[PDB]
Amino acid sequence: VTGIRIED
């Protein structure tokens, strides 16, 4: 992911 703001 590039630009993630919600981790799994």
């Epitope: 993630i4 919600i6 981790e7």
Partner: antibody, heavy 122, light 114 residues
Framework: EVQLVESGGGLVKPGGSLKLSCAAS????????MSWVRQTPEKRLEWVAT????????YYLDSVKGRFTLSRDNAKNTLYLQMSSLRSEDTAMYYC???????????????WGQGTLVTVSA | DIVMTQSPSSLAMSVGQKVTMNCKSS????????????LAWYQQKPGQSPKLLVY???TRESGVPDRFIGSGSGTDFTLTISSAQAEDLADYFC?????????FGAGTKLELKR
Amino acid sequence: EVQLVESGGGLVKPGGSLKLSCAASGFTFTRYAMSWVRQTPEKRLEWVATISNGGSYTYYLDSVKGRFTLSRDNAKNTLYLQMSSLRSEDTAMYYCARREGGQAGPAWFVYWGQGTLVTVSA
Amino acid sequence: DIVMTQSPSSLAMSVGQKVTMNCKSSQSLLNSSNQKNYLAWYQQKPGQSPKLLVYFASTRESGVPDRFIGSGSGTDFTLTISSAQAEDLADYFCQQYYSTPPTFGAGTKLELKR
């Protein structure tokens, strides 16, 4: 009943430090990304910074980079915006908001707080 | 850094008349993979915080009045208020969330026509 309470904003001199807190209620704080958006005296909406739900990845406005530090506390459901080296361009109303959309990229904000007023002046 | 252009800055309206607002971006907010435009609309009464009206160009938020209409694609977007009401006299902002940073427009004031 989502609720966002901002505090910590006040009158500060140029170059001084100030930290804004944002308490969140009515929803699961760990499931959403939180953001700060400021509105200038000229009524211009200006996004400041965005932090992921786990706090690992932080995104800041370019003009503010290196001076504002975003910090999240998922144990107390509180968002913290550290502000250092404050300039007379930073005096604005600072709004705490809850990001929407997916895991990646920016998104719209449904719920906003009432906002803290920050006035930078000598 | 995308530039949002709102037209016009002020809007003179009469109660019950259809109202149209324009918003243009320096980039295409169209994601060809999901065919969805990345543009939101906010309303702000004086002394209050911005209230979301329509996101994804045309998708209306829950609770928002049905008279608000979101339309447009690519670099051009429109907010439409069919049968405008005196409660709708406010500032309106458009925001893109395609790219980082999130940018807003200058805003469009809705004023009463006299």
